[PDB]
RNA sequence: CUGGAGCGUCGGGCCCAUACCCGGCCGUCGCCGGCAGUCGAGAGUGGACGGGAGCGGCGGGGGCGGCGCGCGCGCGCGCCCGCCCCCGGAGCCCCGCGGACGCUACGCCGCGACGAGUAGGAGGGCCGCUGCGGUGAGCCUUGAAGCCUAGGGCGCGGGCCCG
RNA sequence: GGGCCCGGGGGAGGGGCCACGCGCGCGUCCCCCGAAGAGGGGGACGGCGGAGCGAGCGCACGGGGUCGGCGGCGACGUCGGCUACCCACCCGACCCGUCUUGAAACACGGACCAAGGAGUCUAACACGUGCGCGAGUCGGGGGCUCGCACGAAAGCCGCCGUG
């Protein structure tokens, strides 16, 4: 029961699965990162039947719920304390995310200064 | 031979020939090119002369009926639907037609 | 100032409740005329055949002036000259339709694309159905739905056409303005024919679906609206 | 002129922070940190600011004086208000409006005042 | 299942100045406003010019600006050039003018003021006549660049005279096969 | 498979494509598009100001009607005469006196249309790698880079953020 | 059958009407009384004055894109987790790169994994674009100013026009 969002819509995601690269399974030399196949006789680039899907634009998220966390707030990579009072107003729409490489001492000081002015933090119970 | 059958307007007149501009299509782009042709290979095309007779009549039918103000059909107009009428057979039924039996003539 | 403006605007307020009344009533009574005409035209074509039949005589009704053309085959593998016509009738996408005005030049353009289209003489109810349910008007080069008739007058008011019902006069009784009436109508986009066709390839006369079907096209417009 | 600076500062500012598909401005005495034209502190010549009092309790109201700018030492006057969250709000209310002092910030100034006070009271269970 | 050519459906015209100079971007902010609002097509042309390139809004000489203002009737109006006013050393009787321009070369600036004239900029022109009332729009000759000479049919095609690119003109540089009838042929 | 699941000529009914229809979203193009503080929806003027006067009006088409009429002109109040007044307040569906939350003006917004692709071109890439001039009162022995992770997620994706 | 046909007229209480007041003295027209006229009465029609006229709450709505002023079970070994781990199934599905009219090919390269790895610089044109100045405009070489920290920078020179 922490910091409801302003508006919690119905988030729909047209495709939830990743887009692995063609043949990224057979070979280990190939990462799962997408690369648009450009073979002449390649069977994915000519969008054949029952083949892995090529990402295109009409496949993309709703303009309202884009970049939206499952709770409702967009993340903000807050890096220290002074960069938190930026969110003092845009707070019921989006929230604070403490940077990985923040020391454990001030990683605390960022937490309870946020709980002061009601800025939900997604990684608030982190280092300890 | 590529101009044989083609029309074009006249732009020059020498003693027994006539300079004349026609269009000649070549792989696409149409080139308006001017040739010199002696008169024996030339006629007056009445293609123009249907109009200038629709014109002399249109200009006339507009100067008149202007003292009246009644608007007249000046434009041509394509062949309309044939305008429901009657047919009258007088004292005969129509003639009965039957497809005729085949027979090999040779 | 205040109560000299207050009145000045209220007058302009009511001066509309006059006009939008008079404009509402004019439409109402123009719609009574088009009730009397469309009834007299039906009857007086029966009036006549009854009168020739009494004598030993015959009737040839008027050659239909209005024909509603649907395209029935899609777009690939289509001739050059065919493809030019079909974009002059505005049957661009497959399976849409337009009201063409019958005419020596028009008829001789349907002969040349006959294996692609299916045209015929529409009746009144067929004209209504198309215009109301699937009638969109071309305004500022947009397919804008004909939801209110201040959109029809806003485009056609210079021709005495002021309402949804006045459009249908100029579409039935071909009339002086068929050129502007049936070019602000965006091509009707009809669904597939519920129940199926007979044979998209062959002509109606040999059991198919193409070409002209006089007056039988109305069955094709029900199942395709 | 204001419109001039804003074309030098739209990007390329030491207070502009662009990450995570948003943009923001950490400049002093701008309400809601918007990298904007209305809601900017330096560019303008009449600006309203609202930040917590340094004591822990209260609200301080920065008003640019406009008497003479390019005088940053005094061009820029503050004041303090420690009151009851309803007069507090109605002080910045009467101070921005019925003074015809940038009645764009008028509401954004209040929503920043209120959100300041919510941040100085018993924090949590 | 539609059959239009999408070849040239996207219209290629400039809708913003490709340049970064904040000043031009500012009075573009002004006539991005006037153009939408006032019925005057005037600024719709002024706006549609503030986009164009240096190579496309050429400089207007000062003398070509006289003989276009000397014509009977356009007395008392203001010359309006989306461009620069250059000087013309081959002209001396400078009548009094009211000019607007983006730039005016410093020499032409003193010929105009000394003759009891006035020069404005495109923001005072917005306050003089926001509708563009009582104005004259002008431009330099866009077919003036020496580039436009190398354009055309071709050099060497029949009676189509077009300057060829030659590293340096002279006797022995392109007067041979194709130019003198004596040496090969000529066109 | 054999009065058929065979061959002709025909019915109805049904089945299904990324085709067509309606709807949802994503982008591209178009709109001489709207929005930097404004009335106004076939818009078919608005405003002084003077003289005279008033139930007057503008006594014009079965047109079916568009340009003129029945929510008011003048009116209630002050009492035939005066007014018919001021938004620091009319109380607001129009507000022209001051303008959005919205207005990063290369921002935001409303309409439509449309989106196959090699060779190739162009555009956009808060896609990524190393280094410099700036800048982040940036981060860091309370643990940086790298590496590892059936840990939580964001982006159509390049990739990215967190545990 | 059409002239919303003409209509002087009669029914005989024929049906149906987005008609609209009577008072009264208009434009026109029709009818009737009237002299054919003046004028009157009635009607059509127009129009807007010889009238017309003039306001309040409801359902709504088969009315500019859905809301309920409706409700019910669940809770320390049971709720929620799209995507990614393993497994299962139904449908789909031939191995990539390449030259090629045509590649899953009985065409060739490829066991696997790491790191390395290929449109660069210079000069010369050309057009497009940005910026300074504009019948001019430079830029080099020199010169005048430093041991450079930043400098082998920056600044300046009838040199700036010898060219
Ligand atoms: Mg085919
Ligand atoms: Mg075939
Ligand atoms: Mg594409
Ligand atoms: Mg490193
Ligand atoms: Mg071969
Ligand atoms: Mg083989
Ligand atoms: Mg080989």
Question: What's the CA–C1' distance between C145 and G65, in Å?
Answer: 14
CA of A50 to the centre of ligand 5 (A): 30
Residues linked to residue B9 through DSSP beta bridges, in sequence order: B21
Question: What's the CA–C1' distance between C155 and F139, in Å?
Answer: 66
Sheet of strand B17-25: strand arrangement: B8-13, B17-25, B30-38
Residues 6+ apart with CB under 8 A from C49: C59, C61
Pairwise CB contact (< 8 Å): D119 & A116: yes
Rounded to whole angstroms, how far apart are CA atoms E62 and D54?
A: 65
D22 touches strand F (CB under 7 A): yes
DSSP strands (E only) in E1-134: 78-85, 98-104, 118-120
How many residue pairs from chains B and C have C-beta atoms closer than 8 A? 40
Among E51, E126, E65, residue whose Cα is nearest residue E99: E65
Experimental method reported for this structure: cryo-EM
Q: Is D11 exposed, middle or buried (0-12, 13-18, 19+ CB in 10 A)?
A: exposed
Which of chain C's residues have a Cβ under 8 Å away from the Cβ of B83? 62-63
Longest dimension (CA), chain E: 69
Which of chain E's residues have a Cβ under 8 Å away from the Cβ of C92? 2-4
Pairwise CB contact (< 8 Å): E1 & C83: no
Rounded to whole angstroms, how far apart are CA atoms A111 and D30?
A: 24
CB E130 within 8 A of CB E100: no
**Distance (Å) from the C-alpha of residue C181 to the closest C-alpha of chain B?**
19
Three-state secondary structure call for residue C7: helix
Q: Which DSSP string corresponds to E142-153?
A: GGGSGGGGS-SS
CA of A39 to the centre of ligand 7 (A): 18
> Are there at least 3 beta-carbon pairs closer than 8 Å between E and C?
yes
Distances (CA, A) of D101 to C26, D47, D106: 56, 8, 9
CB C193 within 8 A of CB C218: no
Residues 6+ apart with CB under 8 A from E97: E65, E66, E69, E79, E112, E115, E117, E118
> Closest chain B residue to C61 measured between Cα atoms?
B84
**Distance (Å) from the C-alpha of residue D44 to the closest C-alpha of chain A?**
20
> Closest chain B residue to C63 measured between Cα atoms?
B81
C76 touches strand F (CB under 7 A): no
Distances (CA, A) of C190 to C67, C129, C131, C147, C194: 16, 11, 12, 18, 11
- Among chain C, residues having any CB pair with chain B shorter than 8 Å are 52, 55-65, 102-105
CB B36 within 8 A of CB B19: yes
Rounded to whole angstroms, how far apart are CA atoms A69 and A94?
A: 9
Question: What's the CA–C1' distance between D96 and F94, in Å?
Answer: 26
Distances (CA, A) of C98 to B80, C174, D29: 20, 14, 64
Residues 6+ apart with CB under 8 A from C45: C61
CA of A40 to the centre of ligand 5 (A): 16
Among C74, C140, C127, residue whose Cα is nearest residue C98: C127
**Distance (Å) from the C-alpha of residue B72 to the closest C-alpha of chain C?**
15
Q: Is B101 left (phi over 0), alpha (psi -120 to 50) or beta?
A: beta
Q: How many CB atoms within 10 Å of residue B63?
A: 9
Question: Which value, in Å, is the radius of gyration of the alpha carbons in chain E?
Answer: 23
Pairwise CB contact (< 8 Å): D8 & E22: yes
Rounded to whole angstroms, how far apart are CA atoms E137 and E70?
A: 14
DSSP state letter for D36:
S
Q: Is C16 exposed, middle or buried (0-12, 13-18, 19+ CB in 10 A)?
A: exposed
> Is the CB of E22 inside 8 Å of chain D's CB atoms?
yes
Question: What's the CA–C1' distance between E166 and G141, in Å?
Answer: 29
> Is the CB of E6 inside 8 Å of chain C's CB atoms?
no
CB A85 within 8 A of CB D32: no
Residues linked to residue E136 through DSSP beta bridges, in sequence order: E79
> Is the CB of E26 inside 8 Å of chain D's CB atoms?
yes
C1 touches strand F (CB under 7 A): yes
Three-state secondary structure call for residue B5: coil
Convert chain A into a string of H (helix), E (strand) and C (coil): CCCCCCCCCCCCCCCCCCCCCCCCCCCCCCCCCCCCCCCCCCCCCCCCCCCCCCCCHHHCCCCCCCCCCCCCCECCEECCCCCCHHHHCCCCCECEEECCCCCHHHHHHHHHHHHHCCCCECCCCCCC
Rounded to whole angstroms, how far apart are CA atoms C90 and D78?
A: 71
Nucleotides of F under 7 A from a protein CB: 10-11, 13-16, 18-22, 24-36, 41-44, 46-48, 64-74, 84-88, 94-95, 98-101, 103-106, 111-119, 126, 135-145, 153-159, 161-163
Question: What's the CA–C1' distance between D22 and F133, in Å?
Answer: 26
Which of chain E's residues have a Cβ under 8 Å away from the Cβ of D7? 22, 25-26
For residues E36, E42, E43, E45, the Cα torsion angle rounded to the nearest 10 degrees is 100
Three-state secondary structure call for residue D50: strand
Rounded to whole angstroms, how far apart are CA atoms E93 and E63?
A: 10
**Distance (Å) from the C-alpha of residue B24 to the closest C-alpha of chain C?**
22
Among D101, D4, D15, residue whose Cα is nearest residue D43: D4
**Distance (Å) from the C-alpha of residue C63 to the closest C-alpha of chain B?**
5
How far from the centroid of its chain's Cα atoms is residue C133's Cα? 12
Question: What's the CA–C1' distance between E2 and G33, in Å?
Answer: 77
Q: Are strands B8-13 and B17-25 parallel, antiparallel or unpaired?
A: antiparallel
CB B52 within 8 A of CB B43: no
């Amino acid at each position: 029961a922490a910091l409801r969002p302003l508006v919690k819509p119905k988030i729909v995601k047209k495709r939830t699965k990743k887009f692995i690269r063609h043949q990224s399974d057979r070979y280990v030399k190939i990462k799962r990162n997408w690369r648009k196949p450009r073979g002449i006789d390649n069977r994915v680039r000519r969008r054949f039947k029952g083949q892995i899907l090529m990402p295109n634009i009409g496949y993309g998220s709703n303009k309202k719920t884009k970049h939206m966390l499952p709770s409702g707030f967009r993340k903000f990579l807050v890096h220290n304390v002074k960069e938190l009072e930026v969110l003092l107003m845009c707070n019921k729409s989006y929230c604070a995310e403490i940077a990985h490489n923040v020391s454990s001492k001030n990683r605390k000081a960022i937490v309870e200064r946020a709980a002061q002015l009601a800025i939900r933090v997604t990684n608030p119970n982190a280092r300890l | 031979k590529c101009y044989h059958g083609k029309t074009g307007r006249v732009y020059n007149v020498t003693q027994h020939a006539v300079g004349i501009v026609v269009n000649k299509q070549v792989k696409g782009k149409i080139l308006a090119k001017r040739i010199n042709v002696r008169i024996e290979h030339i006629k007056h095309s009445k293609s123009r002369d249907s109009f200038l007779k629709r014109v002399k009549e249109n200009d006339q039918k507009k100067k008149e009926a202007k003292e009246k103000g009644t608007w007249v059909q000046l434009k041509r107009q394509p062949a309309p639907p044939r305008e429901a009428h009657f047919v009258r057979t007088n004292g005969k039924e129509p003639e009965l037609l039957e497809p005729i039996p085949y027979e090999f003539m040779a | 100032n205040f109560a000299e403006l207050k009145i000045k605007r209220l007058r302009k307020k009511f001066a509309q409740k006059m006009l939008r009344k008079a404009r509402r009533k004019l439409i109402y009574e123009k719609a009574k005329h088009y009730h009397k005409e469309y009834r007299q035209m039906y009857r007086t074509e029966i009036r006549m055949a009854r009168m020739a039949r009494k004598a030993g005589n015959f009737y040839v009704p008027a050659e239909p002036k209005l024909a509603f053309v649907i395209r029935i085959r899609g777009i690939n593998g289509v001739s050059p000259k065919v493809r030019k016509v079909l974009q002059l009738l505005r049957l661009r996408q497959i399976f849409n339709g337009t009201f063409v005005k019958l005419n020596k030049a028009s008829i001789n353009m349907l002969r040349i694309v006959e294996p692609y289209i299916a045209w015929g003489y529409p009746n009144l109810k067929s004209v209504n159905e198309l215009i109301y349910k699937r009638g969109y008007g071309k305004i500022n080069k947009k397919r804008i739905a004909l939801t209110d008739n201040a959109l029809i007058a806003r485009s056609l008011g210079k021709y005495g056409i002021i309402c949804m019902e006045d459009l249908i006069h100029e579409i039935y009784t071909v009339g002086k303005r068929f050129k502007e009436a049936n070019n602000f109508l965006w091509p009707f986009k009809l669904s597939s024919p519920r129940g199926g066709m007979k044979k998209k390839t062959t002509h109606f006369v040999e059991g198919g679906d193409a070409g002209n079907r006089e007056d039988q096209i109305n069955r094709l417009i029900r199942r395709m609206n | 002129s204001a419109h001039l600076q804003w074309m030098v500062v739209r990007n390329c500012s030491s207070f502009l922070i662009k990450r995570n598909k948003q943009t923001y401005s950490t400049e002093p005495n701008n309400l809601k940190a918007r990298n904007s034209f209305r809601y900017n502190g330096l560019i303008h010549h009449k600006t309203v600011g609202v930040e917590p009092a340094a004591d822990g309790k209260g609200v301080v109201v920065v008003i640019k004086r406009r008497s003479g700018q390019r005088k940053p030492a005094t061009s820029y006057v503050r004041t303090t208000i420690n009151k009851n969250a309803r007069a507090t709000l109605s002080s910045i209310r009467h101070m921005i409006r019925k003074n015809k002092y940038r009645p764009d910030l008028r509401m954004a100034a209040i929503r920043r005042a209120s959100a300041i006070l919510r941040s100085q009271k018993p924090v949590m269970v | 299942g539609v059959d239009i050519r999408h070849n040239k459906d996207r219209k290629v015209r400039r809708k913003e100045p490709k340049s970064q100079d904040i000043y031009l971007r500012l009075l573009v902010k002004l006539y991005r406003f006037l153009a939408r609002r006032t019925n005057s097509t005037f600024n719709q042309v002024v706006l549609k010019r503030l986009f164009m390139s240096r190579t496309n809004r050429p400089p207007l000489s000062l003398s070509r600006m006289i003989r276009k203002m000397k014509l009977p009737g356009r007395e008392g109006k203001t010359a309006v050039v989306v461009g620069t006013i250059t000087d013309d050393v081959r002209v001396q009787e400078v009548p009094k003018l009211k000019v607007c321009a983006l730039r005016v070369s410093s020499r032409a600036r003193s010929r105009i003021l000394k003759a009891g004239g006035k020069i404005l900029t495109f923001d005072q022109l917005a306050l003089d006549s926001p509708k563009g009332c009582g104005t004259v729009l002008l431009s330099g000759p866009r077919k003036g660049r020496e580039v436009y000479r190398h354009f055309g049919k071709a050099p060497g095609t029949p009676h189509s005279h077009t300057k060829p690119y030659v590293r340096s003109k002279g006797r022995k540089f392109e007067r041979a096969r194709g130019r003198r009838a004596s040496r090969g042929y000529k066109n």
